[PDB]
Amino acid sequence: MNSKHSYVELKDKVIVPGWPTLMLEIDFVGQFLNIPFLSVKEPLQLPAEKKLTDYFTIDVEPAGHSLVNIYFQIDDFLLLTLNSLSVYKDPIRKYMFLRLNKEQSKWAINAAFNVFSYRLRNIGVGPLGPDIRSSG
């Protein structure tokens, strides 16, 4: 019959040291703000015709007098894509959120929560990556 939802935190568990990582870069209207988003096995490339906004809506809101969160909504194609690239076991829901720290929040607050643009961005591992991931 009838259905509706909720915004799950995407916790720090999904970033796993040793592995490559996707970096959410937020450029405030008008010194980006960089959040490691999700540790991945292979880089994210999208259909070249397409672009991230097609698949990924985000929104920055305060959570209190000092802290701020980033909410977002992930169309299924990206959701499925992200889950397959993900090291941590399929952690991406359609409606999720993310906690900036007292530090990160501060910028967002000053920009009046107003996003000019954003993108994801594949970043490689450093010289001890393979050794880090495989030990433990």
Curated annotation (Swiss-Prot):
It comes from the Viruses. GMP binds at D59, V60, E61, A112. It is a peripheral membrane protein. Not glycosylated. The keyword Methyltransferase does not apply. One of its GO terms (cellular component) is membrane. Keywords: Host cell membrane, Host cytoplasm, Host membrane, Membrane, Viral matrix protein, Virion. Changing E103D: In strain: Isolate H1 and Isolate H2. GO terms for molecular function: identical protein binding; structural constituent of virion. InterPro entries: BDV_M (IPR032414), BDV_M_sf (IPR038520). It is found in: Virion; Host cytoplasm; Host cell membrane. Homooligomer. Homotetramer. Interacts with phosphoprotein P. Binds to ssRNA. Plays a crucial role in virion assembly and budding. This is Matrix protein. The gene is M.
